Amino acid sequence: AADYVLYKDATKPVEDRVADLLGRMTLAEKIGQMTQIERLVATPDVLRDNFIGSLLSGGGSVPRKGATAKEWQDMVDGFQKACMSTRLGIPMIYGIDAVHGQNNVYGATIFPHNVGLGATRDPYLVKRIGEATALEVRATGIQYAFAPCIAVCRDPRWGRCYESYSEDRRIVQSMTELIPGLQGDVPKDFTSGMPFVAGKNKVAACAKHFVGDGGTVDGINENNTIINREGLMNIHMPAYKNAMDKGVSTVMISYSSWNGVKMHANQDLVTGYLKDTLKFKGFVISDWEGIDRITTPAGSDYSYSVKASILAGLDMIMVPNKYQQFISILTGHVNGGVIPMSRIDDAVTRILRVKFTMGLFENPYADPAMAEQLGKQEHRDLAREAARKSLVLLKNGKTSTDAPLLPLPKKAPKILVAGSHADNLGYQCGGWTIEWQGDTGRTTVGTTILEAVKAAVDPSTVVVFAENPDAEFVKSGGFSYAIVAVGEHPYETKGDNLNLTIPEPGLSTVQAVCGGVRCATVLISGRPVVVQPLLAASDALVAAWLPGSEGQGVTDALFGDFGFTGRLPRTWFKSVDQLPMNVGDAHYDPLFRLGYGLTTNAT
Ligand SMILES: O=[N+]([O-])c1ccc(O[C@@H]2O[C@@H](CO)[C@H](O)[C@H](S[C@@H]3O[C@H](CO)[C@@H](O)[C@H](O)[C@H]3O)[C@@H]2O)cc1
Ligand SMILES: *[C@@H]1O[C@H](CO)[C@@H](O)[C@H](O)[C@H]1NC(C)=O
Ligand SMILES: *[C@@H]1O[C@H](CO)[C@@H](O)[C@H](O)[C@H]1NC(C)=O
């Protein structure tokens, strides 16, 4: 009728709908679009009264423990209903850290972390993982994933090194194939820097964290990256350009500084480079209290935090709790002329562009028929192939005369499975699983290394498990061989670690097991760790990284259903004193060099 409103018409071009809606919006409605809050502070009134643009779940932020896909859909729809009830009916976009599957969610397939995926050197495999991740995120009603982390981790003492595909940026550039797996492939004619999401079975992606998050002094998390423009652009920047080419919808800014300038206050890189040089037309989102941490101490001048972050070019602020202050402050800056309306309009233009482009206005609500995508066996089978492909065989016999231990026989009278990471799902998934920091034990649905062994061996093979057996026990047990798994515990800044040695017992358990019977040692870690002692005791040793929920990918290789193919995506140091040390360096003296990995052939 004459109740027609251009921005609500799905046949109209995105830029028409964006401009039509933007011309109608009040200041409050505009700033609301720029505000992202945690589900923990949201209520229908808050969402409606403040015209909120977006929600998130931080790590561990879930409706309840063990919630079904359907409980997620209902929570998200409940928030969306409040948002759709505003004067303009602008849907919110809900974001989450699905960085190795839909990992906050119980029952979600958990894929290997990025470092392991780098070991595969298989970008098409990563793409398929994006495809399946998008499905399992839409199964929970969520439209936006805070991924990929395209950091180039240059020092493994960084607690986020596992979120980086490689110390080699060419590998990270290749693994940006995740983006079109999450979002869908961009059309033939596509302009680089334009945002793209194919539709309601895909999600918006987020290249993060812009820029040089992985190059900090001593891999200190959130800290200063001391490098010149040329090293920034040759190492830390290039995968942003690949992400622009594949239409990444959003970019999250790093807590990190670049030669002393806070990334969240850096107008030259955010506005001059990312928006004006790379022609990025999606939206730029802060990290979590990122603008607060512009100041030292953090939060000591939130007024400036706002002024500086928004003038730097940021479009959406992940507040995520003190939304009232954020809105008040930004509103006052605008009313006072300190931030021009053109800046507000650009931020909102970009946010609305992404929302319209992705089809959010046409499908703001969850699809219940997708709930059955969560944990889907076909996704688990993919995760299992990824886990197996990620594994790097570092040693396969103690001397060059020895018989090669791997592949092991599936038939033997009695075998031993041992070690703190043999039967502990949380440990094999690592951080960003169920909780922010990950956790210990049976935290979700999956298969431990022990369970995978039992599942793989001949019915006549007796499998004995002991977490930390003594030497006498192993020597007395009549075992044909042993598989022993040990490593790091799940862990941002909690995983910053100057000494990089796995915790005990670990070494002691390996030494006790391998001293009694021939052993294959499975090392679970997010990064290289001091390994010479583990090597010296072990007949075979596998770097398994953080393989996720499908522990059968480990045994597929151990028992020779598949050959080992993975190759180090990072340099394995002899000593932490050497660090930082990357391929190309001055005195490149690696225990194992980038690219290294032994092979086997399938039996
Ligand atoms: O106890 N406190 O007061 C407290 C303080 C800070 C905390 O830190 C916060 O806690 C988690 C929840 O507890 C959050 O998920 C984030 S993550 C940061 O957040 C984004 C969104 O999740 C990710 O995409 C980015 O890649 C990442 O760099 C944050 O670092 C937690 C608790
Ligand atoms: C880096 O960490 C040091 C030591 O904790 C701290 O004093 C400094 O302010 C940090 N720098 C940046 C840029 O975050
Ligand atoms: C695996 O196959 C290749 C070539 O066929 C060979 O060079 C390598 O030594 C093989 N290993 C075994 C156990 O046959």
Side-chain angles (χ1 to χ4, degrees):
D3 74 312
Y4 179 81
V5 151
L6 203 159
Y7 73 87
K8 292 172 166 173
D9 173 354
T11 68
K12 284 277 176 309
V14 173
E15 309 294 320
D16 293 355
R17 301 178 69 188
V18 165
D20 184 65
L21 170 52
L22 183 69
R24 295 165 197 268
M25 299 177 65
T26 62
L27 183 60
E29 273 164 354
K30 287 168 177 183
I31 286 170
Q33 279 304 299
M34 307 173 53
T35 308
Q36 190 186 64
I37 71 169
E38 233 291 343
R39 53 161 286 273
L40 283 160
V41 289
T43 74
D45 282 304
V46 166
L47 291 173
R48 187 198 286 120
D49 293 351
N50 303 278
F51 311 101
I52 296 307
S54 176
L55 284 81
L56 82 161
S57 275
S61 184
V62 299
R64 79 207 176 118
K65 157 250 185 50
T68 66
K70 162 107 299 221
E71 295 178 59
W72 281 92
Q73 295 197 183
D74 293 342
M75 169 198 72
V76 177
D77 289 335
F79 296 142
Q80 185 70 287
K81 170 155 208 203
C83 294
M84 289 303 288
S85 83
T86 56
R87 179 178 85 92
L88 294 179
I90 300 175
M92 66 79 210
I93 188 180
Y94 196 111
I96 202 166
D97 296 288
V99 300
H100 69 140
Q102 175 61 142
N103 52 71
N104 276 128
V105 174
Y106 180 90
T109 306
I110 305 300
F111 291 89
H113 275 297
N114 286 177
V115 64
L117 304 177
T120 78
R121 309 284 192 281
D122 187 342
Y124 176 54
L125 165 72
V126 169
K127 187 183 187 169
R128 293 142 64 205
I129 289 170
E131 296 178 358
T133 302
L135 297 181
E136 298 211 12
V137 175
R138 283 282 190 166
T140 58
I142 293 163
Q143 313 99 341
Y144 179 28
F146 307 131
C149 176
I150 54 170
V152 186
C153 170
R154 302 297 289 185
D155 193 332
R157 294 168 292 179
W158 194 36
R160 306 192 87 165
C161 206
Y162 68 84
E163 293 198 81
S164 179
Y165 298 111
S166 184
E167 67 195 32
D168 190 335
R169 50 83 141 167
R170 285 163 311 160
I171 296 169
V172 176
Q173 286 181 90
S174 12
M175 303 306 172
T176 55
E177 272 319 274
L178 191 79
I179 292 161
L182 297 170
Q183 307 192 320
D185 290 314
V186 305
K188 46 290 327 214
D189 47 282
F190 192 72
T191 309
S192 170
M194 288 291 286
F196 174 83
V197 178
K200 69 174 172 163
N201 303 144
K202 298 301 197 174
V203 298
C206 180
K208 71 182 200 196
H209 316 84
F210 185 86
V211 60
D213 50 338
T216 50
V217 171
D218 304 341
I220 297 149
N221 187 217
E222 313 203 6
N223 202 255
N224 197 12
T225 302
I226 305 163
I227 189 157
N228 50 62
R229 193 163 224 279
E230 214 179 50
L232 192 75
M233 297 300 156
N234 297 5
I235 301 179
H236 299 107
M237 190 68 73
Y240 286 91
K241 176 76 168 43
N242 299 98
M244 306 295 99
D245 292 346
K246 293 143 187 213
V248 76
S249 289
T250 74
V251 174
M252 177 183 302
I253 306 301
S254 191
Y255 290 130
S256 93
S257 290
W258 179 53
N259 288 330
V261 183
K262 294 276 163 170
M263 280 302 326
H264 284 254
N266 190 322
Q267 186 175 266
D268 280 6
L269 294 172
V270 174
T271 299
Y273 197 71
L274 173 59
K275 302 188 168 179
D276 302 352
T277 316
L278 297 185
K279 303 289 159 184
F280 178 58
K281 307 294 187 184
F283 71 82
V284 175
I285 188 171
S286 93
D287 208 341
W288 173 295
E289 289 166 337
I291 70 160
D292 307 50
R293 303 184 200 176
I294 287 159
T295 60
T296 309
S300 50
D301 189 356
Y302 198 64
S303 176
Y304 180 76
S305 292
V306 176
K307 172 176 143 148
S309 65
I310 302 309
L311 291 174
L314 279 68
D315 303 307
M316 184 179 290
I317 304 307
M318 176 179 310
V319 175
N321 297 326
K322 304 123 33 267
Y323 56 86
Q324 205 170 299
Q325 188 189 36
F326 171 73
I327 291 163
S328 178
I329 290 189
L330 179 46
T331 298
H333 284 143
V334 171
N335 278 345
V338 170
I339 287 167
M341 193 55 35
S342 64
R343 187 61 274 284
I344 305 300
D345 292 345
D346 174 56
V348 179
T349 290
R350 291 162 177 280
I351 295 167
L352 291 181
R353 188 179 286 121
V354 168
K355 294 187 173 185
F356 282 116
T357 295
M358 73 193 280
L360 201 59
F361 288 70
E362 277 57 70
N363 287 277
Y365 292 105
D367 178 353
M370 298 282 286
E372 66 155 69
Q373 297 291 328
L374 190 76
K376 227 182 216 309
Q377 195 58 35
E378 299 88 322
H379 312 347
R380 289 191 190 269
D381 292 352
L382 181 68
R384 173 183 175 171
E385 159 192 2
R388 180 255 305 175
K389 275 157 168 198
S390 65
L391 310 170
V392 188
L393 188 54
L394 296 179
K395 187 179 174 173
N396 189 199
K398 279 187 187 178
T399 76
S400 56
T401 308
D402 272 22
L405 187 59
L406 304 179
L408 294 169
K410 275 174 195 185
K411 186 174 196 195
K414 204 172 158 193
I415 67 169
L416 171 67
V417 181
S420 61
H421 294 52
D423 187 40
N424 180 328
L425 197 61
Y427 282 13
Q428 90 184 41
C429 292
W432 287 111
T433 312
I434 304 304
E435 312 280 357
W436 181 44
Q437 289 296 323
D439 200 348
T440 184
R442 187 140 246 102
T443 54
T444 173
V445 169
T447 302
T448 69
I449 294 165
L450 173 61
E451 301 154 345
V453 169
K454 289 173 106 151
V457 299
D458 191 90
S460 87
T461 298
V462 182
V463 183
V464 176
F465 169 68
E467 179 165 357
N468 188 200
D470 64 24
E472 188 197 329
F473 176 94
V474 180
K475 266 178 301 206
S476 290
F479 299 111
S480 298
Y481 54 78
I483 293 164
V484 46
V486 294
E488 302 189 304
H489 296 169
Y491 50 79
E492 291 168 86
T493 309
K494 303 342 128 294
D496 290 4
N497 183 333
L498 291 188
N499 70 53
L500 293 189
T501 76
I502 73 165
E504 290 303 296
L507 181 56
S508 50
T509 293
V510 172
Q511 292 170 337
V513 173
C514 300
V517 74
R518 66 199 222 268
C519 64
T521 290
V522 184
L523 180 57
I524 302 278
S525 69
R527 57 182 160 197
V529 289
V530 177
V531 70
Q532 295 93 320
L534 285 161
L535 280 171
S538 292
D539 302 273
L541 187 143
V542 177
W545 314 115
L546 304 166
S549 62
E550 305 315 315
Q552 293 171 103
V554 174
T555 49
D556 282 349
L558 288 185
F559 290 110
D561 296 334
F562 293 90
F564 279 92
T565 44
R567 283 155 61 217
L568 289 186
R570 298 197 66 77
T571 288
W572 209 298
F573 53 78
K574 299 189 185 171
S575 165
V576 301
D577 293 343
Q578 305 174 287
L579 296 176
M581 180 174 73
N582 296 286
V583 51
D585 275 343
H587 304 307
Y588 194 55
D589 186 18
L591 184 64
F592 299 99
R593 88 213 155 258
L594 194 135
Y596 178 91
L598 304 176
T599 55
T600 56
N601 303 330
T603 43

